[PDB]
């Protein structure tokens, strides 16, 4: 319901010594599901707090629709006037308050009567399917129920924007799938603009329609998840969005050489970094007669693993320590020599310089 325009936003700490965010530019569309991915310390929470209005840009401006909300160290529209709901990385339900009281809390000074408060809480409780446990204390609720109460609390003032800072971190795995689905269902039910942050890529493919990657305070790439996956601007972005094999080779007239392997791509530097995802590699004991796979050379199996019902096969080129891993329904014993094939249009190459 609200468009977020981030114009040249920077944020410093330690009197300037630490640049948490450096000239960030992004336009998040109204009603969009937007994700931010980046390593620990990249500036995700700092970004979220600036959007929430809990902090301000040191330089630059922030607009909600055409409304200036912060500018160069000044808060123009305070958090309480921004129509935002948040579930922060270290969110906590008040242990001594029931679910009702936890959800009602944000309404205490909103000039609404007891009846108006009850009606609003029950309404959002129904949306989150926890209307039946409103009288329970948080310790009496399941993990899923707790997450629902936290969401209801963030949605009780009818916000236009919902901010989630690493929401599915306190989850095991079965719960994560469920929690991700819930976030999507309630974003649909209310139409809110949604910003979610994480150092975990699974949440991004699950929830986000567009994603921004933050590295050391810099927004290095923005695009649809599949765009970042297939066309990463760097090997670092490549690895953040998904598994990838990273190899360093010498640039040659014929291609990039890594031991006995030769990849048919080129850059400019004398050295190159090759990125190849596991699904874009295939191993074989004989030549593959398929124009969709390209032979890059011989390899030797180093070790095999077994996870997720699949075998993880790790090989190295002849005369190299560089590893390449892939997944297969069938195993190949260590020490066996194999032909290594790749999807050519899927080879990612970057300068080492
Ligand atoms: N109040 C503060 N004072 C000083 N430094 C800060 C403050 N808040 C954040 N930082 C620093 O700014 C950088 C970004 O912090 P932060 O935005 O919290 O990263 P993050 O991406 O959320 N990390 P993580 O949650 O572990 O994935 C780090 O170098 C922090 O140490
Ligand atoms: Mg954080």
| d(C-alpha 38, C-alpha 324), whole Å | 24
CA distance 247 to 258: 8
Nearest ligand to residue 12 Cα? 1
Query: Which residues does a 6 A CB cutoff place in the pocket of ligand 1?
Result: 13-14, 18, 20, 38, 40-46, 89, 199
Q: Which atom of ligand 1 is nearest to the CA of 47?
A: 17
Experimental method of this PDB entry: X-ray
List all residues 6 or more positions away from 271 whose beta carbon is below 8 Å from its beta carbon: 248, 249, 250, 251, 351, 352, 353
CA 47, 49, 52, 57 torsion-angle sign: negative
| Ligand with an atom nearest the CA of residue 165 | 2
Give the Å distances, CA to CA, from 69 to 63, 183, 273.
Answer: 5, 26, 43
Among 11, 20, 54, 197, the mutation site with the greatest number of ligand 1 atoms within 8 A of its Cβ is 20
Distance 55 CA to ligand 1 centre (A): 12
> 321, exposed or middle or buried, with CB in 10 Å at 0-12, 13-18, 19+?
exposed
Q: How many angstroms separate the CA atoms of 314 and 99, rounded?
A: 50
- Domains of the chain (ranges; CATH) run 1-244 (3.40.50.300), 245-279+343-353 (2.40.50.100), 297-341 (2.40.50.140)
Structural element, H or E, at residue 129 = none
Q: For 236-300, what is the HEC assignment?
A: HHHHHHCCCEEEEEEECCCCEEECCEEECCCCCCCEEEEEECHHHEEEECCCCCCCCCEEEEEEE
Phi, psi of 55 (to 5 degrees): -145, 170
Query: This structure's resolution (angstroms)?
Result: 2.0
308: left (phi over 0), alpha (psi -120 to 50) or beta: left
CA of 211 to the centre of ligand 2 (A): 16
- SS3 track for 26-78: EEECCCCEEEEECCCCCCHHHHHHHHHCCCCCCEEEEEECCEEEEECCEECCC
Distance, in Å, from the CA atom of 14 to the CA atom of 20, rounded to the nearest integer, reads 10
In this structure, what token pair is assigned to residue 7? 């114009």
Helix (H, G, I), strand (E, B) or coil at 220: strand
DSSP state, residue 322:
-
Strand locations in 83-126, DSSP E? 84-87
How far apart are the C-alpha atoms of 115 and 255, rounded to whole Å?
73
Interval between CA 310 and ligand 1 midpoint (Å): 38
The residue among 248, 255, 301, 300 whose CA lies nearest residue 276 is 248
Q: At what angle do helices 114-127 and 143-155 cross, to 10 degrees?
A: 130
DSSP 3-state of 341: strand
Tokens of 278: 């596991």
Cα dihedral 77, 81, 85, 87 sign: positive
DSSP per position, 157-177: T--SEEEEESGGGG--SHHHH
The distance of Cα 202 from the centroid of its chain, to the nearest Å, equals 7
CA distance 83 to 67: 12
* Alpha-carbon torsion, ordered 206, 182, 80, 75, to 10 deg: -10
Contact status, residue 331 vs residue 313, Cβ threshold 8 Å: yes
* Rg of the chain over all Cα atoms, to the nearest angstrom: 25
Closest CA to 5 of 62, 49, 58: 62
188 annotated to a ligand binding site: no
Distance CA 278, CA 311 (A): 12
Q: At what angle do helices 114-127 and 174-190 cross, to 10 degrees?
A: 120
Q: Exposed (0-12), middle (13-18) or buried (19+): which is 48, by Cβ within 10 Å?
A: buried
């Amino acid at each position: 319901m609200v468009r977020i325009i981030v114009k040249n936003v920077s944020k410093v700490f330690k009197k300037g010594k630490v640049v948490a965010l450096d000239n960030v530019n992004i336009n998040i569309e109204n009603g969009e599901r937007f994700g931010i991915l980046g390593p620990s310390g990249a500036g995700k929470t700092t970004f979220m707090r600036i959007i929430a209005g809990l902090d301000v840009p040191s330089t630059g401006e922030l607009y909600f629709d055409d409304r200036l909300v912060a500018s160069n160290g000044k808060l123009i529209v305070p958090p309480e006037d921004r129509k935002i709901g948040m579930v922060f990385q270290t969110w906590a339900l008040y242990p001594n308050l029931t679910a009702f009281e936890n959800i009602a809390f944000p309404l205490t000074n909103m000039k609404m009567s007891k009846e108006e408060i009850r009606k609003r809480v029950e309404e959002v409780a129904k949306i989150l399917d926890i209307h039946h446990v409103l009288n329970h204390f948080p310790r009496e609720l399941s993990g899923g129920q707790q997450q629902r109460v936290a969401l209801a609390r963030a949605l009780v003032k009818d916000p236009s924007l919902l901010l989630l800072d690493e929401p599915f971190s306190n989850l095991d795995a079965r719960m994560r799938d469920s929690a991700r689905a819930l976030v999507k269902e309630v974003q649909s039910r209310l139409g809110v603009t949604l910003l979610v942050v994480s150092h975990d890529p699974a949440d991004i493919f699950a929830i986000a329609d567009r994603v921004g990657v933050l590295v050391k305070g810099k927004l290095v790439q923005v695009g649809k998840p599949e765009d970042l996956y297939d066309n990463p601007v760097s090997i670092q972005v490549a690895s953040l969005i998904g598994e990838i094999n990273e190899l360093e080779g010498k640039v040659t007239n014929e291609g990039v050489v890594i031991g006995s392997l030769r990849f048919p791509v080129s850059v400019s530097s004398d050295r190159a970094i090759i990125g190849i995802r596991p699904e874009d590699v295939k191993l074989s004991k004989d030549v593959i007669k398929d124009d969709s796979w390209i032979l890059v050379g011989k390899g030797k199996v180093k070790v095999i693993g077994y996870q997720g019902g699949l075998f993880r096969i790790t090989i190295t080129p002849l005369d190299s320590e560089e590893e390449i891993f892939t997944y297969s329904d069938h195993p190949i014993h260590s020490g066996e020599e194999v032909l290594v094939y790749v999807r050519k249009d899927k080879i990612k190459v970057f300068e080492k310089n």
